[PDB]
């Protein structure tokens, strides 16, 4: 039993809700919140911009030190950093950005990072400003993640379409 409330159950392990991931994180304080990161951990917009804003830019400060030490992430890769005031940990995961020409096959590799964590709050990878089809992202999530994932979808219209089209 966990504190996630109001989710629709899609499969044994995947749950979905129309919610602002920022507000959801502040309420549950999950062990892991997933960020829709880029390889430079530049949290300018989309989910990342919103999460970072909620940390008063502390996420960005921490991320800049991470990059200075380690260099950029790989597309499809991840790193674990602090969750600041939102969660114990933030799993920064880089899905492919279609608006940069990146290979959509890397979306499966991106979701594989979730399997290293028993329970996660997450957005749909490569959705929004990353330019992928969210219906496809949900399909890859369900077919790749085996741990317990609670998906937050900001747009109500999109949430309803994802549910109504789910196989
Ligand atoms: O819906 C999708 C599909 C893929 C990415 N994506 N976005 C989100 C957004 C979100 N929260 C949010 C929304 C608007 C905001 N403005 N300022 C802060 C802030 C926070 N929570 C979950 N997914």
Numbering used by the authors: 3 to 169
Extract from the study:
X-ray crystallography-based fragment screens have taken off in academic and industry settings. To assess qFit-ligand’s ability to detect multiple conformations in event maps, we took advantage of ongoing fragment-based drug discovery efforts through the UCSF QCRG Antiviral Drug Discovery (AViDD) program to design inhibitors against the severe acute respiratory syndrome-coronavirus-2 NSP3 macrodomain. We identified previously published and new fragments manually modeled with multiple conformations (n = 20). We used these as a true positive dataset to determine if we could identify multiple fragment conformations in event maps using qFit-ligand.
We created a modified true positive dataset (n = 20) by removing all ‘B’ conformers and setting the ‘A’ conformer occupancy to 1.0. qFit-ligand was then run but with an event map, rather than a composite omit map. In this use case, qFit-ligand models alternative conformations into an event map, which represents only partial occupancy of the unit cell. Therefore, we scale the output ligand conformer occupancies to estimated occupancy from the background density correction prior to merging into the full system. Following this scaling, we perform standard refinement and note that the sum of occupancy across ligand conformations is a refined variable that can be <1.
